[PDB]
């Protein structure tokens, strides 16, 4: 029981590393999303005054 409880952290360590770095980088690169979102809002405002 000790053997098959321990025998899990062999091929999952790389998955944990890659998921950690990917999730952290995706969370912290939200600056691009914020810039695109504000550009979209301002373009929408310009189009809005256009149809107004």
């Amino acid at each position: 029981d000790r053997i098959d409880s321990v025998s899990q952290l062999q091929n999952v360590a790389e998955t944990t590393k890659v998921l950690f770095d990917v999730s952290k980088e995706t969370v912290e690169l939200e600056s691009e999303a914020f810039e695109l979102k504000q550009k979209v809002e301002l373009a929408h405002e310009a189009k809005a005054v256009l149809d107004s």
Partner: protein
């Protein structure tokens, strides 16, 4: 902001509480021991050890050694009684 890291934190985490306590007990109990019936040490002959390896062996240890001892005792006692009575 870092996520939890279970498989990355296993240095301090052991297998429950009892399994890690008994791991040290069971790892060395099977290390320094005879493989299979090594060192029988059957050979012994020092009168007392001669009895040990001749009749007092534990493989049978029946009443035959006891009967032989009783026969020797009564044989000596016959001469003792002849001397005394």
């Amino acid at each position: 902001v870092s996520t939890l890291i279970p498989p990355k934190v296993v240095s301090s985490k052991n297998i429950g509480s009892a399994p890690n306590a008994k791991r040290i007990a069971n790892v060395v109990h099977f290390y320094k021991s005879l493989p299979q019936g090594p060192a029988p040490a059957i050979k012994a002959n020092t009168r007392l050890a001669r009895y040990k390896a001749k009749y007092f062996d534990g493989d049978n240890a029946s009443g035959k050694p006891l009967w032989h001892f009783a026969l020797g005792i009564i044989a000596f006692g016959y001469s003792m009684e002849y001397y005394f009575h």
